[PDB]
């Protein structure tokens, strides 16, 4: 003990160093349980050749059954608009997402031709260098002013917008609470970012509350990690797969109570909802600042290619350097930018088109009630809703075949409908097959009740 310590202290230095080295050797030996066998073997050249020969690759593409419903593409013999011509038959368009009828306005075409005379068709470069035109900055300023927000950023492709916006902010090790009935663009954006994804029930705040409280428990488990994880809630203003609106005020309250930012998608909502057509926020009266990021695409309402994101500069400015679809691709052609600017001018000039669209949506949604085999899933304010089989059959393929028979019999009677298309093996929550009905400010009253009557008669004829 003490005497041993004194004796060790009285002993020389190099001897004690050697004894310490031996002690370290012993402590290394005790924990060295790796029972290495000390053997090395390698393959021969002929064995490598035979292994090469035996391997057989699968074909690049699997054979197709050739009976795919999507194998036959509808061929439009002209512009897709009111009174279109599809498959050689005269029809009335009930499938194109053109809510405001801005596709065929002479003013929009005049603006597009004016910008075509000046710049041409192609930008020929990314926005990062010699691909930024004055029209791009003008359009971004117009989008910022229209939505009463500081900054906006434009992408040249609608799908890439949210799919590049989401990975820019959400990184590995974060938590995202996304709705179950989220569009495919949001799903691929959430796949690109390697964050942890938690899905809650469609338009249910109870499941969101439960998930948030479980996250709170996990935060209390380890505060240090909980201090470096960011929480996001990704929702859509008007869901495409269902046609139902989102409960914004409760989401805002949950955000401020549980410290999780909000990403909002307004693709259908952007140009149809609100007194001036600004989205679900104007419909509910929620302040614009309560939502961090609002994504949209100019393809549906504005009738032009591309998309955009809107928000405060603190949030938007990061996408100019982290958005892959923005950094590594050519910019939007000036033609489509000018078309979007003119569409914005027309939308600002007259705000009654949103009111007449709401009128027509309500009328057609009320009229389509009372079909034996068809149920109208959706809401009375969305321009696009669905028609689903009430008593579904045993398989999905028979259901899509029945719906396609209904669609064909409708087209033969000058009603142009379409059926919702999904990737069966890729969609997270595959929706049931459903016919899609889209309402415009161009469809007259008589056409509305005629389409309702035609769909009713065809449904009764087919499903009985």
């Amino acid at each position: 003990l003490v005497e041993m310590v004194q004796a060790l202290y009285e002993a020389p230095a190099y001897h004690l160093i050697l004894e310490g080295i031996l002690i370290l050797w012993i402590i290394r030996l005790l924990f060295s349980k790796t029972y290495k066998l000390q053997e090395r073997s390698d393959l021969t050249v002929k064995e490598k050749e035979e292994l090469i020969e035996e391997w057989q690759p699968e074909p690049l593409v699997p054979p197709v059954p050739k009976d795919h419903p999507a194998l036959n593409y509808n061929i439009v013999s002209g512009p897709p608009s009111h009174k279109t011509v599809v498959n050689g038959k005269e029809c009335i368009n009930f499938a194109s997402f053109n809510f405001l009828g801005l596709l065929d306005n002479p003013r929009v075409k005049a603006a597009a031709l004016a910008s075509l005379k000046k710049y041409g068709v192609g930008t020929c470069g990314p926005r990062g260098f010699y691909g930024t035109f004055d029209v791009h900055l003008d359009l971004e300023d117009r989008l910022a002013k229209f939505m009463k927000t500081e900054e906006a950023i434009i992408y040249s492709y609608g799908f890439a917008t949210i799919a590049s916006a989401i990975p820019a902010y959400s990184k590995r090790g974060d938590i995202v609470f996304v709705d179950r009935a989220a569009c495919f663009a949001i799903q691929k954006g959430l796949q690109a970012s390697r964050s942890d994804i938690k899905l809650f029930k469609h338009n249910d705040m109870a499941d969101l509350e439960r998930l948030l409280k479980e996250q709170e428990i996990e935060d209390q488990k380890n505060p240090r990690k909980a201090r470096v994880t960011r929480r996001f809630i990704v929702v859509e203003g008007l869901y495409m797969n269902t046609g139902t609106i989102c409960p914004l005020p409760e989401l805002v309250k949950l955000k401020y109570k549980y410290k999780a930012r909000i990403f909002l998608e307004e693709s259908l909502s952007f140009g149809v909802l609100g007194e001036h057509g600004r989205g679900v926020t104007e419909h509910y009266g929620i302040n614009i600042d309560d939502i961090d990021l609002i994504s949209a695409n100019m393809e549906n309402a504005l009738a032009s290619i591309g998309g955009f994101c809107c928000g405060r500069s603190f949030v938007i400015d990061h996408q100019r350097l982290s958005g892959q679809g923005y950094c590594f691709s050519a910019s939007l052609p000036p033609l489509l930018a000018a078309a979007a600017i003119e569409a914005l001018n027309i939308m600002e000039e007259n705000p009654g088109i949103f009111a007449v669209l709401k009128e027509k949506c309500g009328q057609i949604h009320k009229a389509l009630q009372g079909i034996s085999g068809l149920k109208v899933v959706g809401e009375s304010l969305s321009p696009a809703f669905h028609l689903q089989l009430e008593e579904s059959t045993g398989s999905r393929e028979q259901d899509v075949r029945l719906l396609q028979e209904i669609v064909d019999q409708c087209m033969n009677r000058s009603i142009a409908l379409t059926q919702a298309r999904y990737l069966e093996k890729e969609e997270k929550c595959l929706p049931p097959p459903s016919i899609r009905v889209v309402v415009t400010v161009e469809q007259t009253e008589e056409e509305l009740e005629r389409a309702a009557s035609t769909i009713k008669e065809v449904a009764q004829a087919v499903l009985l």
Binding site: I52, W55, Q56, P57, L60, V61, P63, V64, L71, Y73, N74, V76, G78, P79, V86, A95, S96, N98, L103, L113, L116, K117, K118, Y119, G120, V121, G122, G125, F129, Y130, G131, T132, F133, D134, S156, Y157, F159, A160, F184, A185, K188, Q191, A192, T229, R231, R261, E299, A303, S304, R312, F314, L321, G325, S329, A330, P333, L335, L336, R421, L423
Partner: protein, 491 residues
């Protein structure tokens, strides 16, 4: 594989003194950036960046501050070089809206006056189709009047038009493959058609210098990714042999598929891919080939049919041929060409077709008109003239630049010419001095490239004449004398 004509590429190595000096510069920048950050943190110096709103102060911070270190300290100092607005057609001469900043590039304010006649060497013109007047513009205007600005639905439902079908058949005839499909974005083409071809349990062999779109498409699919060295056929042999012999990583099972992603011309380096060798190994080891002819579809080849025509091989050897209309044809979009079964499967099981909006009618009309002009269907000789003029211009420019003593990368045939600056300050210096002499160039710095290799890329065109090239060459020689950019020991 063998070459019918010589394949000569030159990648001269950096001088040692230049390496030491660029490391000195980067160290100085790092130290001053740390001091800058300390001053900004202790509120001694005012911060010009925006801040989170007071209601979300107790929220977790949105960004990690260390990630933007280079943005504030290195990128912001020379930020004025890149996002330069223009107000005219991106021809051989472009108009740039000149801008000034008094807060050291944190905020830019636009002066009224506008620069005019700037020689354009940053735009991706290769055949000079970016013109505001011509036949293509007339056809585009006609289709715009008839059809409109854009389609409002996807291909599968109602958004398929006759224009798309005729464009696809024209592209299939142009390439030489059986069938082709068209998309509205070159980035989306890769990012949405690589996940469909391969999935979990497959292998992807990506080059060292692949584009961001190809990498993103590979990541979105669950396949395992292995990176081989840039144009190193020995490395490709080694990875192929190891993948075939040793199988899957955890449980030894045969790979379902082996896909090799390569490009025709790499924009930054300017090196043309060694296509005969890679096709030879593809056939020998029973792999699949994905070829990205974004830069070579119009620039390369005697008639402008890509690297498969430049080398002279058979298009049926390449399994998937991606391509982009933005560079050469002067309109946005993209395409994939291949056999009929491939195109049918992509028509049925591709993300872009199902969920994304189709192309615009004026854009497809412009592509159709330009592609018809190239193949001589209009009957004129304009198609061959641009293709031969581009080769003359690139050979003349590369020869004269190399005889001046600069260091140039890539093959002699590639229209893209990367000059090497090698130092962080010379990037901004070269950009500003070249702008002062009415020349527009593109400068690429550290985080994109390797640390010692910073460059400036010249993208040549058939629109450039001999006079314009002579003026640009004289200005480049004068600037290289000013900044001592001639690092070549050979000449």
């Amino acid at each position: 594989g063998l070459y019918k004509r010589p394949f000569n590429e030159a990648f001269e190595e950096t001088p040692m003194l230049v390496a030491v000096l660029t490391y000195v510069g980067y160290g100085v920048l790092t130290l001053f950036g740390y001091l800058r950050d300390f001053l900004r943190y202790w509120r001694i110096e005012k911060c010009h960046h925006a801040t989170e709103r007071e209601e979300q102060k107790d929220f977790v911070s949105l960004y990690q501050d260390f990630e933007n270190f280079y943005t504030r300290n290195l990128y912001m100092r020379i930020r004025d070089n890149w996002n330069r607005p223009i107000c005219s057609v991106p021809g051989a001469r472009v108009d740039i809206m000149e801008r000034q900043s008094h807060d050291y590039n944190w905020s830019f304010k636009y002066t009224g006056n506008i620069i005019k006649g700037v020689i354009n060497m940053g735009s991706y013109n290769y055949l000079g189709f970016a013109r505001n007047t011509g036949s293509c513009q007339e056809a585009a205007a006609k289709v715009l009047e008839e059809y409109g600005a854009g389609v409002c639905s996807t291909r599968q439902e109602i958004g398929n038009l006759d224009k798309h079908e005729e464009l696809e058949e024209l592209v299939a005839r142009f390439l030489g493959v059986e069938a082709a499909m068209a998309y509205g974005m070159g980035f989306a083409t890769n990012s949405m058609n690589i996940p469909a071809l391969v999935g979990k349990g497959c292998l992807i062999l990506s080059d060292e210098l692949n584009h961001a779109s190809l990498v993103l498409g590979a990541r979105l699919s669950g396949a395992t990714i292995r990176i081989f060295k840039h144009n190193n056929m020995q490395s490709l042999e080694k990875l192929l042999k190891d993948a075939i012999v040793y199988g899957q990583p955890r449980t030894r099972r045969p790979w379902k598929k082996i896909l090799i992603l390569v490009e025709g011309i790499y924009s930054m380096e300017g090196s043309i891919v060694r296509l005969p060798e890679v096709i030879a190994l593809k056939k020998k080891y029973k792999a699949y080939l994905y070829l990205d002819e974004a830069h070579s579809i119009g620039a390369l080849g005697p008639t402008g049919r890509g690297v498969v025509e430049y080398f002279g091989l058979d298009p049926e050897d390449v399994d998937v041929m991606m391509g982009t209309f933005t560079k050469s044809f002067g309109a946005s979009g993209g395409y994939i060409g291949g056999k009929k079964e491939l195109i049918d499967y992509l028509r049925t099981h591709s993300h872009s077709a199902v969920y994304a909006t189709s192309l615009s009618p004026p854009v497809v009309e412009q592509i159709i008109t330009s592609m018809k002009c190239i193949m001589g269907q209009d009957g004129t000789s304009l198609g061959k003239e641009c293709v031969q003029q581009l080769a003359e211009n690139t050979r003349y420019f590369r020869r004269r630049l190399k005889e001046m003593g600069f260091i140039i990368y890539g093959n002699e045939d590639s229209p893209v010419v990367p000059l090497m600056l090698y130092m962080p300050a010379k990037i901004g210096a070269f950009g500003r001095e070249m702008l002062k002499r009415n020349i527009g160039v593109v400068v690429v710095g550290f985080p994109a490239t390797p640390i010692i290799e910073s460059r400036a890329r010249f993208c040549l065109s058939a629109a450039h004449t001999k006079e314009i090239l002579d003026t640009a060459l004289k200005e480049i020689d004068e600037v290289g004398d000013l900044l001592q950019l001639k690092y070549s020991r050979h000449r």
